[PDB]
Symmetry: D3
Subunit: 237 residues, 6 copies
């Protein structure tokens, strides 16, 4: 066991899907995985392990923010033999052409966190996903008839930022989605020699706003999970 | 409602106790509060409101890390009229004389987060608690026969820090406990004009280690909550 | 003797009150201390030792700015056995409700100095007073019928700032007074294992021109000194 | 003409390959392009335009370092209608398993330059390549039977670093090659709304002395150029 | 009058020599100036105006540290018509071949203060003296047969630095003397539109800790003053 | 030979003049030097050695930007016995009273590069020229009846800066010319133990954008070269 995961080596698959919302883990397990078994409950961060088309997959929420997801992803990698982490979540958009419910794949993640500067002697660490994982997700999306955008996310420490002007800067430099985890997950992946990818669906436009329905949201969430799961199978080849 | 709290103005008391572990909220409500009612369930962050010796109190977990607790504390203050937040949690000790199960009260909180530099034009914001809340907790502890230490916490972004030498620096400068939230809560309190306090019990010594029992841990957790609750009553005068 | 203090161990009390102006230290000794003798005059930085209600007390100027006061406080602590420093100064106010002549107690001090980043591995050190000293000062003020606000000071390196915009930021985050020393003294206290407190009277407002009389201002200054001295007597018990 | 390029719109193709050495751009044009004409010689920074398998292509040196290449890439993009830049260079390796002659594709580039912090409000901009360009290069390499590693470069400001310790850090975080330009070019591409990719061949190792033959090294260099050129043809489709 | 100087336009010469110690300003006035009158004593910061060889000259202490001297130099420049400031101070040496009592002229000044970053948008401002003044001092020293080195000073915020290793870096980069003011005075001169020079005498050795006689101190102190005063006369021609 | 210069000890004079443009080095060799021989052409970075009035002199381009010139100056110093580097460059003016074709001498150089912070433990290193060299250039200019201003340059990493407002700050602080090298050359001179000076001719105005004739360019270019060359002769005496 580790400080935040009451489990033993072997309880997790070598691939873990991670939503921020812990309630989604059980949903994913019941909706997409066969023969799922409970493998963690510490702090209510429920974790499950089962199979998707015969392939062992685990799912466990990561909580909000870089510090939270950094804890879970580190423990998974160092103590549970996890090789790949796929964060599946939502993001806010700043680009006019990026629309609600679009699927965005973070090949890179900008951040205003200090965690990577702490790792990288106060220089600029480019927080990046594993390239094959990115391409697997793009290909899996295309096979499902979904076109996904690939580029930079911005991983914010403050959901409520006092710096209103930063959204304009994000937009100028082509940021596709704003969330709060990717750069931290990518940093941990590099630190401990594993691979990661963050996929998000656009839940908000920080410009236009203009909302959606619960059924549309569930459909889109399901699409994202299908993409993530099918992408793993392509990665296995 | 707010993005992370499905409730309305009035559903929360003007004082909120916040553990990191969401499972503790329900425990606190059932163990210490009368007539408790459920007021939030979004993302499983259960929130309750009831009374302690007639005084309205709410309890809701804040999740791990500065970004997570910054979201909840902000929403509580700006949308739910919350005036005081008391984080109640655990910390790791670096000072030899600070012992397992000691109660520590963070009058200040150091941090390696960038969130306060972002707020404060890249200068040093001293992240501090409300003084009366600190003194109320000290006095409430003394009335319960518990001596509490008052000083600086260190609010870490990385539970698993690559900088081993930082613990020595923390120790040199008198840091009483290491946790992951106080500086962020204090920053939000200052940003939105409210008051906050972080109280922690020492769960680990990052030096000696040397563990405890489950019964001892529960007793100590109960002591901390009693301190927090009684401290509120002193604050009311 | 030390490089900036021509005195020997025993010449100072274990508590030293410190105004910025050495002429003001002579004022304090003459006005409040019995049997006061000058114990330093190097660089004109007058220091005195005498008694207050039978208690040995010293008072000595610290000069203007963090680097100046850091020299004197360090030397007192490491070479003259000084355990407590109480800065007694003036500050400017930025908050509408903070008025000329208010007494402000710096439980914390923000700063644009780099000195604490230098001490603390480029992270945020919360420069704090000693809690018991703060409480003693609050209680002494109450006994004298004086209101005292407890919160953050801002210790500035530049009395004449190019960044007028920083005053709006201090106001936003609730800074009670602007001065030039507290964060430096609190950093020295932490570094060398002593205790400190800064008390100021508001001598100026950013907006402004409320003004008072010389007699009233000098009365309030004296009240600050009485609070400081009486706080020592409470600590002793 | 621009301040550093004496040419007119149309003189360049919409894709430009860029080695650091202008003598190497002449080499590439002579070796791989048909009907190549020199289109720039300002400051000796030779640029050429010709065809590869009937496709219009340009090649031009970028000089050494982020500031030099930032000038040329900006001017090409804003004044010569250039849509894609492919840097073709050499890099040093720090990872044991990365060998002399390996082909490295910089999906991201780390850096100790301040240029992106200047662009991005002092936060972390993940300097990334264009994903489709990365995929085109990976696919072209595969068609040529060449292995290509995709990951982070480190773009250094100082070829002769005082900080020997930074190489251990790059190695720890998995950097595939050290060069001097990629992060700068990726920053320009993002700023001015174009697309870029850096491909390097490993010319040196930190440890070391594996060595090869001139013929083999030059063969691998040519393979990098073929990968670059063929990647364009794949993008066109 | 200004907030720290009780005097009026005309009371100061257009050139002011400034040691850190007000008592030294007094010594300089008594020893070198004719018809010297005291023009300030606010905060004990003695200032005098007299003549040297018929030339009107002032001398006034500036206290210790960048924040202190920044106050006095600013006020002199903006409110007393002062055109040139010549700091005449002491410094500690780090270079083995720099000896006690050596005269050093700071054409530039390094610093660990944040003040110039605050002025210069967090970039590197090279804090430099006025060239004509440097040259005047060099020539005067030559006419007096006094040796003088020209180069970089380092202006420290912490006389008692916790970073002993930085002295190795100063030594590496050829720093001639460590003092606490020059870089701030140079930044004020630039901000407020005047001219400045810092001359120091090596009063201690940071490595050897070695010693001097009372007689030696102020005959060399005298050499520094003579250089400063004669340099003004050259500048006048 | 070194990695960027194919030559041997003795091929270069102990003084090297360096423009950014290799073609200008060629022009200088042909115009000012007798018996000039080409000693390098690696990367097209032409270098020549000849005599000026019997004095052995070299001239070689250093390319654009701090990283480029840092490579060449280092190699010359460590492997070719070069004692003095004189940059002879162009710059853009920000001050209204600085005119096209004005000659500026950088006694200091500000910068937005991180290179000196990397050298100087993230403090402010004042990047300064050798004083004797500055004085030699001033005197030579006077003997030639050529006006020359002495002061700060600013060495930019981005010729195309996204921060237009910084030019207001440079203007405020009296920056004489904006170029891209001086601060890096000065940092190399200090690191590797040689001497350096940057002289520039104002080739454009950053505000007016105004214009010059071909004839005007290189007669003033010529004035700069004459100053540099004659300054060496003075230094030799």
């Amino acid at each position: 066991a580790t400080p935040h995961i009451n489990a033993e080596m072997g309880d997790f698959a070598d691939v873990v899907l991670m939503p921020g919302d812990p309630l989604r883990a059980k949903y994913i397990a019941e909706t997409f995985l066969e023969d799922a078994r409970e493998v963690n409950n510490v702090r209510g961060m429920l974790g499950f392990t089962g199979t998707y088309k015969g392939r062992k997959i685990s799912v466990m929420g990561h909580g909000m923010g870089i510090p939270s997801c950094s804890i879970y992803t580190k423990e998974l990698i160092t103590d549970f033999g996890v090789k790949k982490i796929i964060r599946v979540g939502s993001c806010g958009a700043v680009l006019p052409h990026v629309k609600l419910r679009d699927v965005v794949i973070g090949m890179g993640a900008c951040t205003d966190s200090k965690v990577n500067r702490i790792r990288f002697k106060d220089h600029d660490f480019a927080a990046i996903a594993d390239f094959d994982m990115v391409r697997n997700a793009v290909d899996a999306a295309k096979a499902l008839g979904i076109d996904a955008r690939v580029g930079n996310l911005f991983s914010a420490d403050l959901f409520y930022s006092p710096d209103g002007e930063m959204f304009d800067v994000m937009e100028k430099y082509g940021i596709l989605g704003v969330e709060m985890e990717a750069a931290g997950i990518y940093g941990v992946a590099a630190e401990f020699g594993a691979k990661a990818l963050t996929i998000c669906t656009v839940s908000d436009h920080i410009r236009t706003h203009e909302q959606t329905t619960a059924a549309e949201r569930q459909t889109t969430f399901n699409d994202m999970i299908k993409i993530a799961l099918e992408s793993v199978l392509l990665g296995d080849k």
